[PDB]
Amino acid sequence: ITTLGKFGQQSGAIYVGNFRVVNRHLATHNDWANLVWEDSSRDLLVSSTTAQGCDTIARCNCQTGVYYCNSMRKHYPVSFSKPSLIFVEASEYYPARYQSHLMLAVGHSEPGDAGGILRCQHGVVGIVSTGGNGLVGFADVRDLLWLDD
Ligand SMILES: [Cl-]
Ligand SMILES: [Cl-]
Ligand SMILES: [Cl-]
Ligand SMILES: [Cl-]
Ligand SMILES: [Zn+2]
């Protein structure tokens, strides 16, 4: 799989409390100026917002949910792995390396699909980060208890 990037004017973001959660590879100058936390190994960055967001972070162990696929302009039901340490090929965004806290699924993804939200009954689970060959990989956020406190 490889890191996908984002095509189109859609946010690719979770807005919870006074945080914005994005793929690290899509973080803006404003994100880095308002940095709270980032981890390259997870492809995650969190910045601070003035506006209150409405997202709820799931605190479950669900392995089924629904994600948004930008390339197909559709939501899909999906079955995804536990957060895992997966090998990710080189791209414009990272050299080849192991990416942690990544959940793999059989599901459509193309370049430009990063930032699509994965959600379950409990709330937001994660965001598309990687994919290829009929697989999609989601960066989990559910372990970050300080997002929703
Ligand atoms: Cl890294
Ligand atoms: Cl489940
Ligand atoms: Cl969505
Ligand atoms: Cl591939
Ligand atoms: Zn859940």
Automatic annotation (TrEMBL):
An example Gene Ontology molecular-function term: zinc ion binding
Membrane topology recorded in Swiss-Prot or TrEMBL: Peripheral membrane protein
Single biological process term from Gene Ontology: symbiont-mediated suppression of host mRNA export from nucleus
Catalysed conversion reaction: Selective cleavage of Tyr-|-Gly bond in the picornavirus polyprotein; a ribonucleoside 5'-triphosphate + H2O = a ribonucleoside 5'-diphosphate + phosphate + H(+)
Cofactor(s) demanded: Mg(2+)
Keywords: Activation of host autophagy by virus, ATP-binding, Capsid protein, Covalent protein-RNA linkage, Eukaryotic host gene expression shutoff by virus, Eukaryotic host translation shutoff by virus, Helicase, Host cytoplasm, Host cytoplasmic vesicle, Host gene expression shutoff by virus, Host membrane, Host mRNA suppression by virus, Host nucleus, Host-virus interaction, Hydrolase, Inhibition of host innate immune response by virus, Inhibition of host mRNA nuclear export by virus, Inhibition of host RLR pathway by virus, Ion channel, Ion transport, Lipoprotein, Magnesium, Membrane, Metal-binding, Myristate, Nucleotide-binding, Nucleotidyltransferase, Phosphoprotein, Pore-mediated penetration of viral genome into host cell, Protease, Repeat, RNA-binding, RNA-directed RNA polymerase, T=pseudo3 icosahedral capsid protein, Thiol protease, Transferase, Transport, Viral attachment to host cell, Viral immunoevasion, Viral ion channel, Viral penetration into host cytoplasm, Viral RNA replication, Virion, Virus endocytosis by host, Virus entry into host cell, Zinc, Zinc-finger
Binding of Zn(2+), residues: 60, 62, 120, 122
Task of the protein: Localizes the viral replication complex to the surface of membranous vesicles. It inhibits host cell endoplasmic reticulum-to-Golgi apparatus transport and causes the disassembly of the Golgi complex, possibly through GBF1 interaction. This would result in depletion of MHC, trail receptors and IFN receptors at the host cell surface. Plays an essential role in viral RNA replication by recruiting ACBD3 and PI4KB at the viral replication sites, thereby allowing the formation of the rearranged membranous structures where viral replication takes place. Component of immature procapsids, which is cleaved into capsid proteins VP4 and VP2 after maturation. Allows the capsid to remain inactive before the maturation step.
Subunit-structure text: Homohexamer; forms a hexameric ring structure with 6-fold symmetry characteristic of AAA+ ATPases. Interacts (via N-terminus) with host RTN3 (via reticulon domain); this interaction is important for viral replication. Interacts with capsid protein VP3; this interaction may be important for virion morphogenesis. Homodimer. Interacts with host GBF1. Interacts (via GOLD domain) with host ACBD3 (via GOLD domain); this interaction allows the formation of a viral protein 3A/ACBD3 heterotetramer with a 2:2 stoichiometry, which will stimulate the recruitment of host PI4KB in order to synthesize PI4P at the viral RNA replication sites.
Protein name (record): Genome polyprotein
Species of origin: Human enterovirus 71
Lineage, top ranks: Viruses, Riboviria, Orthornavirae, Pisuviricota, Pisoniviricetes
